[PDB]
From a paper:
TRPML1 is a Ca2+-permeable, nonselective, six-transmembrane tetrameric cation channel ubiquitously expressed in mammalian cells and is primarily localized to the endolysosomal membrane. TRPML1 has been suggested to be the major calcium-releasing channel in lysosomes and is involved in multiple important cellular activities including lysosome trafficking, lipid accumulation, signaling transduction, and autophagy. Loss-of-function mutations in human TRPML1 are the direct cause of the lysosomal storage disorder mucolipidosis type IV, a neurodegenerative disease characterized by abnormal neurodevelopment, retinal degeneration, and iron-deficiency anemia. We also determined the structures of the mouse TRPML1 channel in the apo closed, PI(3,5)P2-bound closed, PI(3,5)P2/Tem-bound open, and mucolipin synthetic agonist 1 (ML-SA1)–bound open states.
The synthetic agonist ML-SA1 can by itself stabilize the TRPML1 channel in an open conformation and the structure of the channel in complex with ML-SA1 was determined at low resolution (∼3.5 Å) in a previous study. For a better comparison with the PI(3,5)P2/Tem-bound structure, we also determined the ML-SA1–bound open TRPML1 structure at 2.3-Å resolution using our protein sample prepared in the presence of this synthetic agonist. ML-SA1, however, is a highly potent agonist and is sufficient to bind and stabilize the channel in the open conformation by itself. In the ML-SA1–bound TRPML1, because of the tight packing and coupling among various parts of the channel, the local conformational change at the ML-SA1 site also propagates to other parts, including the PI(3,5)P2 site and the luminal linker domain despite the absence of PI(3,5)P2. As a result, the ML-SA1–bound open TRPML1 structure is almost identical to that of the Tem/PI(3,5)P2-bound open channel. The Tem-binding site overlaps with that of the small-molecule agonist ML-SA1, and they appear to exert the same driving force on S5 and likely yield similar local conformational changes. In the structures of the open channel activated by PI(3,5)P2 and Tem or by ML-SA1 alone, the luminal linker domain undergoes a similar rotation movement coupled to the shift of the S1 helix. Similar pore-opening mechanics was also observed in ML-SA1–activated TRPML1 and TRPML3 structures.
Numbering used by the authors:
A (entry chain A), B (entry chain B), C (entry chain C), D (entry chain D): 40 to 198, 216 to 291, 296 to 527
């Protein structure tokens, strides 16, 4: 019961081969797997980029075609301030829709019945929504509101009545123009793909929910991709390459599972042996240590890779169009595959500084982060509610977190101060509070929190560095 | 006189319970208090954001309605350079005021007698201010000025004479157009609130105080919020939740006060005992140490929370409209409540690195800051007066401080240099001085001051870290 | 010969008083001197800001009055691309000059004979400069140039011939329009000052020196300030306060000189004594050490303060108008006065960390900087010549230095890369070189140079810190 | 066999002279070489800047002359959205070309036969490219495409038919307008150079490859520089100075080669001696160490300098016009020459901190970088494919690398987050992935990777610092 096997288990592939004539199959697979997974990622990215561009470019074209006086870059300030301006914008949108085929550079088809729920079979719906009862009378400081929402729709069919529109401004909530357009993404031919049919759902909103004398106007689109009914192109190895990637990932999965099982059985044998030699129920954290975390990482990376590859095959077969989910799966798998090659550098301590440090430092780092997180969250909520109405970088919780995290790393500091300087928070009290808030957060987190964090990490390194 | 009580006083809640069967009431209150205070903060923020948006959006609408040729973003460069331009801008403002009801998207009411002190009961006042005597004659290098200010006002009433305005350009100081508009913030219905009446005081200024051939034009508003006289909405737990928050905070206050008193009495007993056993008047800094700073922090946090909650109740009852003060109170209380939970991590030294370091390092840090502050203030004053006229980031003292503080953290460096590069300070001497100023400040504070500060903090950490 | 005097010389003011009943006159002067110098700086800054604003605002007004189609912010791209555009711009400038009094918001006077050297007594000179001989014939790839510059001027007098202007485009070098305007800076009355007469020399340049089909157009001004011949204002302590500042600075100067002399005499006595007791010519660096550098700093600060104060008196007396030099003197003196108060913190080692560190670290820091400076200068020259034509941040040597210095501190990195990304240097070779240049400079200086610099500074601190 | 020669070999120039009366010729050459190489670099930069400006300014002029409604700064958003807009832009370009001589401020000559391959001897070619067969019918979800590209060109000759252009929009790929213009860079006379003939190849592209309803329009130029056939200027030491630089560099090369040979021979002699005294084949890494890396650096720097100087002579002689390659050679040589002077500071250890540290730290640094590079590359590929379609900073691989490298140094953090905030990736899944990606990358690389890197560098410094 010398158990030299337990010695051969924790052996570098070079030592595993000098000792037992064992070809490093897993090491060779990783390099080939890295190459094939990265190549597959790039190949998918070609068509993914084509799709995203098509959607974005069409949206910009719609904004230039339907939004009166639209100019690039003014998406957040585009608004109407006069009754005449609002009427002109609405009528311009409808008129441009009605003459689209004669003007548009793209080849768009109308969608009969695409006007939405309010379009009773019409292509375009022009809905205005107002309170059921509204009697705003600021002169007498009096109002009488029935906040029930009434929807009034005008049906527009491509080849008028919509010109007779009268807007109830004093109680208007919003006006919307819903219509759908069909077009074919021909550019996919460059990738030797068959073009799909894209249906864009276009929603133009004139938003008066604030009743503030300023009515923002925006255009939004939703895209639906589907195979064309009758495609004909007079014109690859992509499917074969995806099958190859699946083969490599399946082989690596099999090898990793076999190694994990062998390690678990060795753990059981060792544990029962130590129970014989010394006392029983003696090993605990060690039973855990008998596992290889890198083999778990590889197993989960190749599972993600197989899922992404199957999804890529489905998208190319036109069974599904979820390019975002597939791109995310393939990119995460590529990153994990690149990371996995560090497993073979963990044997030589000269190249293993990063991982050894991480292993030593993570418990203290997590204990530190526990304390630092409550302070961070308190600051986040405080800033979000107090400064969010006044500060453009504190509008939402995620935005506040991004702002504070970038401030911790010394980024965009003066711009953060200047945002409050420019408007003074329309209240010296808010400005003074922002001064105290920003100075205290920056000083605390840059000089104490970050200094202590770094000190913990470098202390862990000093612990693993032999000197 | 073993005084195991003095042992039970400085005990962790887990130890306080394993020893005396004591339920950690304060620990449980903190979590519940955290939750309820944060929820209340968010709930208040809903309506606070509604109010701030209403004010800002109305101001933008006014700028588009009354400022001739106004475009978004040009607030600091909007100005007139010709007599005709100034006349056209003034007359455009008045004309737009006179036809407001027919054009405005918002529902505004005039305010008869709102023209201000210069409007003798008129709705709009159009005042021009000029020197009592002014005989500027640059051709003969001669002038004769009586700098007494004369105000001449034209009364405008909504349904002319103001068209006959003649401006004394050579001695004009400024022209102002004061009027008031009433509107109802209907959007508050989404929060199940009763809309208020907002009165906006609008002041348009054509400023010629510089006599420089360029007359900046700006629009400012003041807002006054009050309950409507006759509201009617055909349509919550907010008051009940505020009462709940008050209950939790009052209970925590009571517990903290009771604990503080118990600790003070224990301090007195211990001190008199040590006076018996050893010499008299022996304890000093220790008598102080017998206090818990966290219980003081909790007491002041719940006082702030109660004040903010009462103010929130008042605002919802429409007894007052001070959303900024209430928001500041609630946000500060939320931050303090989140911070207070670290009290229970100060018992375990593994999680107490930050606080222990702070405690060890603050005296040396403050002694260092004493010296660093005089240098910083000297630089601040120097930059403010020498570079403020030429540099857009040195305009005011607070702006100079923000600039220098962000420079210490390496932020917006090149933009700071480039501001002086672009104009060269219209004097090579000023440019050279700015070069020396910026290089010396940046080098000194980034490489010496900050290095020494960090070294002090990490030295304190090394002192409390057991290794 | 116990020389307790040499003990009393190196004594803190508190010790100097507990020992010899000596009131700390210098310590009290520093605080009062700080206060009065800062107040004087601010008071001067009021009028300095007024002057600078006047100049800048007038320049902007001129650009809007004389530059056809000018709009704020387009100062670097404002240019003509067509013969008609150039003619229209020139004629617009002249026409606006000719009707200035009827349109300008400022009160400007013409200057008869102000047209410059080319104006033979005329108010406006419109000069075009072209080669004496120019026969550019790109069709035959032939030219014949006599690069002698010929100046042709048209005289314009305010109440035509200039309308008959014909420009020799193929050989045109530039066109210039020179004229002068007089105006009175009335706003100075707010500071209770007598307004001065400002003469602006306006130069409009249509620059064709590049012969590139694009003719940049710019407006420049020079300002000359002088007292008005016949001022009359129907309407301070500033002179008295300046005399007070001079008094305080002179007293401090006297005390510092007396102390420096006493220290030098004590040095001589000690040195000769040590020559008696021990060998002769034994002391060297110590003779130097017997001097107080802070007393030298104070002496030079109060000299600067007196010079600045006398200059301020001169400017207020209207004997001179050099606000930039005076502002620089007063600001430097204010900074030095604030710094000087650290002298009294150098006695207590707890507050003297910064200065003691600096003293220990400066030799090693300077030896390090010697080596780092040659690398920095090599990079500066390389970047300036190779990348300056393509990169907007490398245009000039000072700009290159600012760019590299800010890069060392991690500032504006991505913008620096993106500048080269956007144009690709119109040559992949230049882009690749810029990649190597930026990556190598950033990596070297951030990770090695700065790390070593900080290590030297903190090592010096470790040397002076008692632990 | 005392071999004091081996002692005299590793001797500082001061010691080499105190011992053997040896004038430090190489040390003196370095200073003179530094001066002359830097001066030559600046002198070349004069003309290099002239050339680059000429090209850029002409390109901007062309964009203003030929692109309808072009305005500065809108290069990436300039596009057509309507059939009428596209026709107007095309016809405007052609019309402006046809009347160029009467309008252009520059003196341009037509190039007969310069229209390109599609111009059969014509000056201007106006080509439209469309699919051989295209039957896009989105209404029936059907298409029939023959993706063969058909080119149809219209020949335009300067002093119509091109007005009869009909564009097949449904199958249009792109339209291009190719023409050439000749002009003379007269500004070179300021450098006392003979102006060259520049031929600009202008390509205007209306790109419809995306078929997205938006057709970007761009103008590109290629420049060809050649000597004029018949130049005549009625009008330096540059060639003499270049010969001087060549002389200095050749002398330094000779001295460095002689020293390298002497060192190699000394290595051989020492090695064979040690083989006699002690065992044979004993020295290995030492034989390598017997070489001076600085002499290799100097040799390669002066080789680069000579190549650049010869190229500069060629360009001035008009035998070649490759200013970019010459500028790169001269700038790299200047940087290397400045760096080379550190060789004489490597003798004194007080000034040799940087180099000694680098020498000690490079092996550990490289081992660390090996591990860090796979993680970095994985992140780069992941970001490039997943976020590149949505994020403007992830468009290309080089751009992704610049973004991640600047993020490591804490640069442009909040802007990176905000880019994804603004559009939300049009998919909450993409936004969430970007959040995880950015947070994980920033945290890992700033807090662990960079901390460990710095710790390695400062540890190497601690190893070479005597304390
Ligand atoms: C226009 O206003 C109506 C009514 O205010 C909005 O309709 C609501 O939409 C939300 C989310 O789509 C639903 O949860 C509600 O049930 C709808 N009705 C009400 C009474 O709230 C509509 O969303 C607005 N349109 C746009 C484009 O914003
Ligand atoms: C227009 O100019 C007048 C006179 O210069 C300003 O009136 C002064 O305003 C300040 C602050 O409001 C008061 O302290 C003064 O008493 C007022 N009179 C004088 C003679 O100074 C007025 O503020 C200016 N208007 C605007 C909108 O700036
Ligand atoms: C960002 C990382 C590093 C460290 C220590 C600087 N740190 C904080 O400073 C506080 N803190 C958060 O709570 C947090 C939560 C989500 C995003 C970013 C942060 C964030 O910056 C922290 C705290 C908890 C978890 C991770 C971290
Ligand atoms: C900002 C904090 C950290 C530290 C040490 C970097 N530090 C300085 O560098 C000098 N300094 C001021 O005087 C100061 C005053 C107000 C705002 C910011 C500052 C500021 O940056 C300082 C000095 C005094 C009090 C606090 C601090
Ligand atoms: C800026 C300071 C700090 C330090 C060490 C970072 N450092 C360099 O990195 C190289 N370096 C110059 O040569 C230099 C010269 C002029 C302005 C800025 C610099 C500059 O950044 C340097 C070198 C010489 C003198 C001062 C310094
Ligand atoms: C930039 C230098 C310093 C250091 C250690 C921070 N480091 C990384 O963090 C990872 N890393 C790359 O892989 C890399 C490759 C190309 C450009 C920039 C980088 C880059 O930032 C790295 C890694 C390999 C080679 C050089 C370096
Ligand atoms: Na930055
Ligand atoms: Na930074």
């Amino acid at each position: 019961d010398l158990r030299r096997r337990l010695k051969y288990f924790f052996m570098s592939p070079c030592d595993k081969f000098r000792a037992k004539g064992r070809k490093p199959c897993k090491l060779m697979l990783q390099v080939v797997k890295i190459l094939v997974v990265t190549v597959q990622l790039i190949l998918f990215g070609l068509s993914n980029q084509l799709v995203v561009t098509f959607r974005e470019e069409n949206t910009i074209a719609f904004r230039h075609l339907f939004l009166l006086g639209y100019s690039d870059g003014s998406d957040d300030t585009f608004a109407a301030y006069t009754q005449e301006q609002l009427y002109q914008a609405i009528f311009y949108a409808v008129d441009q829709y009605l003459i689209l085929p004669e003007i548009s550079l793209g080849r768009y088809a109308y969608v009969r019945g695409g006007g939405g729920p309010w379009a009773n079979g019409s292509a375009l719906a022009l809905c205005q929504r107002y309170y059921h009862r509204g009697h705003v009378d600021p002169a007498n400081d009096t109002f009488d509101i029935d906040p029930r929402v009434v929807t009034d729709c005008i049906q527009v069919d491509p080849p008028a009545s919509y010109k007779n529109l009268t807007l109830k401004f004093h109680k208007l909530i919003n006006v919307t123009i819903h219509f759908q357009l069909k077009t074919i993404n021909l550019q996919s031919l460059i990738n030797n793909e068959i073009p799909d049919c894209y249906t864009f759902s276009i929603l133009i909103t004139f938003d008066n929910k604030a009743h503030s004398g300023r009515i923002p106007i925006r255009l939004e689109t939703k895209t639906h991709i589907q195979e064309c009914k009758h495609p004909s192109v007079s014109r690859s190895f992509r499917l074969l390459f995806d099958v190859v990637v699946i083969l490599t990932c399946s082989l690596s999965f099999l090898l990793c599972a076999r190694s994990l099982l062998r390690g678990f059985l060795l753990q059981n044998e060792f544990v029962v042996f130590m129970w014989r030699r010394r006392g029983r129920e003696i090993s605990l954290w060690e039973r855990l240590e008998f596992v290889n975390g890198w083999y778990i990482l590889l197993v989960t990376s190749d599972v993600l890779t197989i899922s992404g590859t199957v999804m890529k095959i489905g998208i190319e077969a036109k069974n599904l169009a979820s390019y975002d989910v597939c791109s995310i799966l393939l990119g995460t798998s590529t990153l994990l595959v690149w990371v996995g090659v560090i497993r073979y550098l963990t044997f030589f301590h000269k190249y293993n500084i990063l991982i050894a440090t991480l292993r030593v430092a993570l418990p203290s780092v997590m204990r530190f982060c526990c304390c630092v997180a409550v302070i961070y969250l308190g600051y986040c909520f405080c800033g979000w509610i107090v400064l969010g109405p006044y500060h453009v970088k504190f509008r939402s919780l995620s935005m506040v977190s991004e702002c504070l995290f970038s401030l911790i790393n010394g980024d965009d500091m003066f711009v953060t101060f200047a945002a409050m300087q420019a408007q003074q928070g329309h209240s010296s009290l808010v400005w003074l509070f922002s001064q105290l808030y920003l100075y205290s957060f920056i000083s605390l987190f840059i000089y104490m929190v970050l200094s202590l964090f770094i000190a913990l990490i470098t202390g862990a390194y000093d612990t693993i560095k032999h000197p």
